[PDB]
PDB file of C-alpha atoms in Angstrom:
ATOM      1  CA  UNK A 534     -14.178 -27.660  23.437  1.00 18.65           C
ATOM      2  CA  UNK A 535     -17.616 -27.021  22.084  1.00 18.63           C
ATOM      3  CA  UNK A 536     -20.127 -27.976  19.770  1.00 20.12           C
ATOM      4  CA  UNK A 537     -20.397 -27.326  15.854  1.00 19.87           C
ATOM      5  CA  UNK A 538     -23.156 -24.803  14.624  1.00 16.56           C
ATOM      6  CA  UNK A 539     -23.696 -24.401  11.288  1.00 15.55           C
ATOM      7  CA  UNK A 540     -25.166 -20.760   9.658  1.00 18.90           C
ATOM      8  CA  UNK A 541     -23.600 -18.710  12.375  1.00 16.49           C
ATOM      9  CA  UNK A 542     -20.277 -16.565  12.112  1.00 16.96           C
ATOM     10  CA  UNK A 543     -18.292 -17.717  15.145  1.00 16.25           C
ATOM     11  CA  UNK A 544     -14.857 -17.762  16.116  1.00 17.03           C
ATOM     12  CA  UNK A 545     -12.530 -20.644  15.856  1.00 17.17           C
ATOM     13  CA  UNK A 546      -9.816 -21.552  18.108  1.00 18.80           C
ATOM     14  CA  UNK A 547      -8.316 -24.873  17.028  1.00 16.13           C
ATOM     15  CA  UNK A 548      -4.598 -26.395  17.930  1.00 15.68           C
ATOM     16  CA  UNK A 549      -2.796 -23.736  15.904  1.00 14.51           C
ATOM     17  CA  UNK A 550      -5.519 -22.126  13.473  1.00 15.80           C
ATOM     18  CA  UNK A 551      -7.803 -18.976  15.059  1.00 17.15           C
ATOM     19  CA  UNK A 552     -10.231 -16.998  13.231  1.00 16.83           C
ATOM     20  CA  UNK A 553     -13.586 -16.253  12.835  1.00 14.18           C
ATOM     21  CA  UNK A 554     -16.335 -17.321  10.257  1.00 13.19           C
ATOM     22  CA  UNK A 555     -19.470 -19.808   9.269  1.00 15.00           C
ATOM     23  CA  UNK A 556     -18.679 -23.365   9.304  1.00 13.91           C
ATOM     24  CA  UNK A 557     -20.907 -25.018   6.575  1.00 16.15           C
ATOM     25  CA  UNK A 558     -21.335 -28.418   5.010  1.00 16.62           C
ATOM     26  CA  UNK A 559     -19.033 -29.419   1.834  1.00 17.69           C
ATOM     27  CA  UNK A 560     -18.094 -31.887  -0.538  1.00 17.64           C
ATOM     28  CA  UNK A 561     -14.222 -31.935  -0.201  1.00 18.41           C
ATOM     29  CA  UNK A 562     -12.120 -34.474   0.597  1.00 19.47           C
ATOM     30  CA  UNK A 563      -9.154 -34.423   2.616  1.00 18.41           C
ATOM     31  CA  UNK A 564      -5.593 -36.904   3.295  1.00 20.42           C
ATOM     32  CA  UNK A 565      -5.427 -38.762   5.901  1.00 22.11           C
ATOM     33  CA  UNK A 566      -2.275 -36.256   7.189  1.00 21.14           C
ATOM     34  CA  UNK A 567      -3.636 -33.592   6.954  1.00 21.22           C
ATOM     35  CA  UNK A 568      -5.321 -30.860   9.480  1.00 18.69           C
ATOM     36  CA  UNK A 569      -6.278 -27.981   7.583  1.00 21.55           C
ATOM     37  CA  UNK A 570      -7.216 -26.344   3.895  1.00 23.27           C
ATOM     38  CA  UNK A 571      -6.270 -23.309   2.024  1.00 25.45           C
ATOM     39  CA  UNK A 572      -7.179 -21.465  -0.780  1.00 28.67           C
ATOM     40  CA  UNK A 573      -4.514 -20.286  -3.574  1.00 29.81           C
ATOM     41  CA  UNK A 574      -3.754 -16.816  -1.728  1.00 31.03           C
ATOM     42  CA  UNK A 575      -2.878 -18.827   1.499  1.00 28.78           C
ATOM     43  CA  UNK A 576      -6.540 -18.203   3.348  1.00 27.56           C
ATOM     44  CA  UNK A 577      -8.699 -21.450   4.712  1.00 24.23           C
ATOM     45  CA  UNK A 578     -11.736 -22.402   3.049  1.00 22.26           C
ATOM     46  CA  UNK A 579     -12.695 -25.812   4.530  1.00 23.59           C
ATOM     47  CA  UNK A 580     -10.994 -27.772   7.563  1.00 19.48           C
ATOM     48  CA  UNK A 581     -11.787 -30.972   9.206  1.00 18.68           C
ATOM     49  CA  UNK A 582     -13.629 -31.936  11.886  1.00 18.46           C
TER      50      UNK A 582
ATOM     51  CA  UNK B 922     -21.565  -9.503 -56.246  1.00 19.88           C
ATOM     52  CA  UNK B 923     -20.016 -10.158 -53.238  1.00 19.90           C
ATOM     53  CA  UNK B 924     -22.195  -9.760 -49.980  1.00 20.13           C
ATOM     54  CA  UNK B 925     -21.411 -13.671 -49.042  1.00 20.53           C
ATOM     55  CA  UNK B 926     -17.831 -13.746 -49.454  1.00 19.15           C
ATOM     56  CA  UNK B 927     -17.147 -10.735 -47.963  1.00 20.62           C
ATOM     57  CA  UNK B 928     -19.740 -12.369 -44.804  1.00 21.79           C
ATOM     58  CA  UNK B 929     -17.575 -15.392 -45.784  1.00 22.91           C
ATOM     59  CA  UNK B 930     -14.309 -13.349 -44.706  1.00 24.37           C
ATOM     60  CA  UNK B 931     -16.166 -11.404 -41.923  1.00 24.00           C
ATOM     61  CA  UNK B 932     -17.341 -14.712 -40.423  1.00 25.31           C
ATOM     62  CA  UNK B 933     -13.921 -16.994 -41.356  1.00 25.22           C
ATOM     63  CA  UNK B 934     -11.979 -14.498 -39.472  1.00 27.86           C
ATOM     64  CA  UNK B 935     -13.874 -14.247 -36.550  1.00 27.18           C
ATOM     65  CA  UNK B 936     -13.876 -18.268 -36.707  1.00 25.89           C
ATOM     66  CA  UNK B 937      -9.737 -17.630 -36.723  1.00 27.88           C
ATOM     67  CA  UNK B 938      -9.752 -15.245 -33.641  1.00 27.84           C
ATOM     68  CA  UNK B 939     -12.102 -18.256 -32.171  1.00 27.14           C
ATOM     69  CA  UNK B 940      -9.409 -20.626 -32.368  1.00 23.40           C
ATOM     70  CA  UNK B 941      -7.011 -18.243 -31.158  1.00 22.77           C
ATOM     71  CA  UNK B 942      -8.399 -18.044 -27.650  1.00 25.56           C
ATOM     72  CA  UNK B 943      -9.347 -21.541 -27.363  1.00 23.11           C
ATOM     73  CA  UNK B 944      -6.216 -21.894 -28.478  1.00 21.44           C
ATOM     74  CA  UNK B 945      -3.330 -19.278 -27.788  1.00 18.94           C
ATOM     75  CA  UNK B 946      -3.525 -18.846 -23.849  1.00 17.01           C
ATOM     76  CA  UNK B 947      -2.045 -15.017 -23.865  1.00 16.22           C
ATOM     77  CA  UNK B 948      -4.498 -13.964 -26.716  1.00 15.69           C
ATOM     78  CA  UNK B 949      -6.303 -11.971 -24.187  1.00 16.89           C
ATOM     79  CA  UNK B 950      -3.304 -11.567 -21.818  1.00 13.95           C
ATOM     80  CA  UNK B 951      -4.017  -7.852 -21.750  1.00 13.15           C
ATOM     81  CA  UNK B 952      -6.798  -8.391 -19.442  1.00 14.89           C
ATOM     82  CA  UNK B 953      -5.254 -11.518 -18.023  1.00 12.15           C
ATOM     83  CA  UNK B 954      -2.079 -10.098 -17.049  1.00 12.95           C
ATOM     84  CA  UNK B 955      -4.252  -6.830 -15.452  1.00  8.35           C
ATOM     85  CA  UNK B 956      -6.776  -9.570 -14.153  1.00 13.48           C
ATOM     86  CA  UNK B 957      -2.985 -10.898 -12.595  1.00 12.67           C
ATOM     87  CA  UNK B 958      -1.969  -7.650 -11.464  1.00 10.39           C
ATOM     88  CA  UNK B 959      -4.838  -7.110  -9.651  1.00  7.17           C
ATOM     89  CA  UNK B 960      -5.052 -10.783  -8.203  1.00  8.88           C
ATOM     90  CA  UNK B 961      -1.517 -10.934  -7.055  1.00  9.42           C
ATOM     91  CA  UNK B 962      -2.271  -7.281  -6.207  1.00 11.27           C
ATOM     92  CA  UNK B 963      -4.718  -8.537  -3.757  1.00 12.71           C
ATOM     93  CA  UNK B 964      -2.731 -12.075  -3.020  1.00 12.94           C
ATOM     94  CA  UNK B 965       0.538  -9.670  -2.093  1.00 13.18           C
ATOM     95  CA  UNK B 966      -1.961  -7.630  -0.311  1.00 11.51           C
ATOM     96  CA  UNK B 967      -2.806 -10.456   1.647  1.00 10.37           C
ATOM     97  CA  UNK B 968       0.978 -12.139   1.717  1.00  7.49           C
ATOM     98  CA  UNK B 969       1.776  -8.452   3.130  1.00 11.88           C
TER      99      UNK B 969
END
């Protein structure tokens, strides 16, 4: 694994999501069972840590 | 004679048409449906 930056479009390789974007700090809050967010058309917009 | 009511009619149905749309959801559904079609023409293009 590796570190978080912040600003920086980077790729992301997690335990079943890939991509690549900018990781920023946000206000959301997630369950405690759950892994990942999406948006209405299916497309992550904020994950956790 | 009648420059106020007829701004009285002017202005009372434009007060109507404002409680239409805070009101009547497919009031501007012309638009919102075409707003639609293009969202779920992006959203399909993205579920294709």
């Amino acid at each position: 694994s590796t570190n978080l930056v912040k600003n920086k479009c980077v790729n992301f390789n997690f335990n079943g999501l890939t991509g690549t974007g900018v990781l920023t700090e946000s206000n959301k809050k997630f369950l405690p069972f759950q892994q990942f967010g999406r948006d209405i058309a299916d497309t992550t917009d904020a994950v956790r840590d | 004679e009648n420059q106020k009511l007829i701004a009285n009619q002017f202005n009372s149905a434009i007060g109507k048409i404002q409680d239409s749309l805070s009101s009547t959801a497919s009031a501007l559904g012309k638009l919102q449906n075409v707003v639609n079609q293009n969202a779920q023409a992006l959203n399909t293009l993205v579920k294709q």
